[PDB]
Design a binder for this molecule. Structure first.
Ligand SMILES: CC(C)=CCC/C(C)=C/CC/C(C)=C/Cc1c(O)c(C)c2c(c1O)C(=O)OC2
Ligand SMILES: CC(C)=CCC/C(C)=C/CC/C(C)=C/Cc1c(O)c(C)c2c(c1O)C(=O)OC2
Ligand SMILES: Nc1ncnc2c1ncn2[C@@H]1O[C@H](CSCC[C@H](N)C(=O)O)[C@@H](O)[C@H]1O
Ligand SMILES: Nc1ncnc2c1ncn2[C@@H]1O[C@H](CSCC[C@H](N)C(=O)O)[C@@H](O)[C@H]1O
Lengths: 395, 395
């Protein structure tokens, strides 16, 4: 694809974005990235990859220490010059200006006549769940990626055997314990991860949104309280962000919403009397205790585990499924390995960097499900979103 | 700015690029990066900044250990599938494909029907000087940026006072010596750096190219061998790539070209009977030994030093200058703090993370030059080129 060819494909993607077609925003972004690569000389690729981006990561991390994005949000259309922001942040003015000027250059904040102004991005990054995501990513994930070359040279360029305890995460952070055990042993990073989970794919269509999975036809239609008064269980749902969205979309609810996660996660949920779900403790490596519910939902859970654990996780739902009633809803990335895209590779490498795990093709998922005693009904996807929704049933 | 307005500017700069207008390639990349910023939601920014790019850096680093880009260059348009490259690189084929698919998604290589192919980018990165740049950047510069949050938290968010010994480089690499001393004390990174200086801005218009600095009218016109038989001294020219480029564009040369650097750099230059310059050792903090030359040229040298040192560097040329004849040519970034651009913020932060130094405005440079006993004749710039060309003369 020549630059002239990409310029045309970008202009055609822009028209579809203007027509508000699904995924056209994401397609317009990917055409813009392909155009950059077709134009940059190798020296510019070196400067962007190893100068601009590591410095951006460092400054954005430093932003969470000094309240930078919160000050620019509160300053609104007025903004703040370098002297003002240096005074609020407690920073040397020349230091601040130099760092903020990289943010301007990287399109994270804007400047005009010496004044700095928030963006929708920087205003969005001021929220506490993004603050804690930035901290987790820079303090925890970044060193694991930095250790890929030495670790894989040291292990013979082998895929980590057990995944849980012989990967780049353990070498970077100088431990011989698994990443979940590391989380529990290294506060505040368990809590940052719990906040992070409400942010890693936010602002994208949800599995249950309109045009994606037909929730109303498959779940609400035919829901039967004589079989079970539970409508949906979110197995591994974290603090509940996902099940909370579902409840808001499909109210009045005909049955209960049950959140399941580990006790340390469940205890972290802020008390709210408007809550529509019941926050419960359940370990996915034991048999599912809620019986015959209309739907059992997982999002970004078995993708962190090897084949045997992924088969157990799914098989532990089987004893609770009511034949001809209970849906198994697996909300996970399905790798199309003939068409690689960044949404899948990002998560696959994040899975390698933390859990020594991997993302899966439709064939791999079909195999884990069949071994678990389940079979696929249908797979649903939506343009622009990373994950698919695999509906499964008792084999 | 609005996406629909960036869409038009991108299309406008596309027309300018297809007319081969100066800097239009660089403006199209900039408009492409601006559109992506206007479209990406914060969660996508998080995944790109904190997953895609650190993963990209490490895979490009790992590529230099297993001869990847070279194998893809050898394969030319035939390419290699995952099993073949895994065999050649000595990696598990599953691990290789996962890492190679991120290079595909990030536009570093391409894929069709399970075959991977090199690009102009990956083919260019196979060259040794880029291989060593990659090694330097991921091993040496990467941890320096990674220590920015903790270092400036600890030092009070202050500019490094001395710069050389009190910076994030010393904090990241657990030393209290200067970066130049660290280089000498940590082979092979000195020589990696020396190769790196032929790559960090390669493929961009040089100061002496057509439409930039008028070398012929200012230097060749009026060259007077009765004053001196030396046409140009490159003060701090590394292994001589810049002075070699100059000699080839302006042959047959009317006078001598003299390179000056540290002996540990000069004695790393491959012996070459076709070379057009004389390779000499000279310390920029001693008086310039070559007397009355037509030009004394500096590229990316005093930007690495504080004000007092940079004055000495420029001042040490003054005793050698022939009044009304000798030109001083300083080829450095001139920061426009009314217009932040990646080309200057990149190298400014690079200067901070290695030398504790900074890039300078036109006011800063004029003040240093005046203190050195010099005055500015003119300042030359070129669309899309990071550096300017400041011509100075005896005050
Ligand atoms: C409370 C306790 C007993 C132990 C800790 C339990 C725990 C949090 C375990 C981790 C389980 C797991 C599948 C993690 C796998 C996982 C993701 O899925 C997602 C989306 C992300 C990351 C990740 O590691 C990540 O770094 O960025 C997003
Ligand atoms: C051999 C010896 C005795 C001493 C070592 C002398 C030495 C190499 C000192 C370094 C001097 C100096 C101004 C360095 C400043 C400098 C750059 O300019 C450029 C373009 C780059 C970097 C950099 O640090 C960098 O990291 O990426 C490109
Ligand atoms: N053994 C276990 N039992 C129950 N939950 C577990 C578990 N191991 C990991 N988890 C949970 O699985 C989740 C994976 S991250 C996914 C969170 C949420 N489903 C979302 O997509 O936003 C985490 O919340 C983690 O606490
Ligand atoms: N004290 C000193 N005396 C002479 N050269 C020095 C020096 N300190 C640093 N240098 C040289 O200054 C150069 C800075 S990097 C710039 C290299 C080259 N001018 C280019 O633009 O590509 C290095 O080659 C380094 O060896």
């Amino acid at each position: 694809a020549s630059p002239a060819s990409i310029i045309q494909e970008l202009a055609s993607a822009a028209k579809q974005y203007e027509n508000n077609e699904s995924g056209a925003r994401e397609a317009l972004i990917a055409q813009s990235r392909a155009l950059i690569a077709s134009l940059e000389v190798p020296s510019e690729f070196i400067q962007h990859t190893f100068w601009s981006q590591p410095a951006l990561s460092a400054i954005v991390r430093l932003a969470t220490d000094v309240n930078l994005f919160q000050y620019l949000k509160d300053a609104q259309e007025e903004g703040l010059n370098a002297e003002a922001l240096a005074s609020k942040t407690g920073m040397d003015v020349s230091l601040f200006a130099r760092l903020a000027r990289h943010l301007v250059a990287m399109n994270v904040i804007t400047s005009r006549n010496g004044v700095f102004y928030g963006t929708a991005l920087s205003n969005g990054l001021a929220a506490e769940n993004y603050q804690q995501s930035i901290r987790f990513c820079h303090d925890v994930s970044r060193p694991s990626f930095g250790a890929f070359p030495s670790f894989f040279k040291g292990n013979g360029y082998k895929t980590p055997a057990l995944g849980t305890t012989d990967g780049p995460f353990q070498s970077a952070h100088k431990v011989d314990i698994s990443f979940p055990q590391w989380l529990v042993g290294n506060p505040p990073y368990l809590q940052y991860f719990n906040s992070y989970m409400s942010a890693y794919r936010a602002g994208k269509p949800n599995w249950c949104d309109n045009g994606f999975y037909p929730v109303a036809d498959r779940l609400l239609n035919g829901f039967d309280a004589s079989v079970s008064d539970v409508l949906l269980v979110d197995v591994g749902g974290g603090r509940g962000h996902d099940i909370a969205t579902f409840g808001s979309q499909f109210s009045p609810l005909p049955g209960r919403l049950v959140l399941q996660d580990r006790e340390q996660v469940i205890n972290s949920i802020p008390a709210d009397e408007s809550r529509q779900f019941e926050a419960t403790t359940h370990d996915i490596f034991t048999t599912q205790p809620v019986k015959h519910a209309r739907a059992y939902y997982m999002h970004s859970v078995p993708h962190g585990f090897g084949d045997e654990d992924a088969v157990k996780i799914m098989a532990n739902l089987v004893p609770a499924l009511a034949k001809g009633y209970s849906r198994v809803l697996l909300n996970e990335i399905v790798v199309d390995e003939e068409r690689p895209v960044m949404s899948a590779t990002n998560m696959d490498l994040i899975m390698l960097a933390h859990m020594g795990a991997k993302e899966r093709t439709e064939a791999d998922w079909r195999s884990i499900l069949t071994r678990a005693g389940l079979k696929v009904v249908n797979i649903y996807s939506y343009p622009g979103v990373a994950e698919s929704l695999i509906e499964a049933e008792l084999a």
